Amino acid sequence: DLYSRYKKLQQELEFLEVQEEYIKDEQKNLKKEFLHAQEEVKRIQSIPLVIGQFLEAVDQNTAIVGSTTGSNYYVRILSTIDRELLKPNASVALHKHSNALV
């Protein structure tokens, strides 16, 4: 009764401490991984990039772009780009090997 409840409380508290320490460690590692992922996203915006025309927005992340190589491509818009800056016929730099609207 009383002692059993007390022991259960202690075990629960110890498990909560374990979970807290786990979560803090995972938070640190996730911050590191987020930094690496941000670095990779920024690196995808490197040079050279092919210029194209933002013909039409299709989804929140995918558009149709007319690359100045003379070809229309259905590509994926990078998240960090300001959506309000995406106007039709605006000049946009696209990834060389994937045409992603960089």
């Binding site: 401490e17 807290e20 996730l30």
Partner: protein
């Protein structure tokens, strides 16, 4: 007898506080993991 009850209530308040803390930490980690996954 009542010493059991005092220990139990003290542990109970500690566990409630740490449970709220753990829930907050879980929410923070969840949002960070969602950002990483995206």
């Amino acid at each position: 007898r009542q010493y059991y009850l005092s220990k139990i209530e003290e542990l109970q308040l500690i566990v409630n506080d740490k449970s709220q803390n753990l829930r907050r930490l879980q929410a923070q980690r969840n949002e960070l993991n969602a950002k990483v996954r995206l």
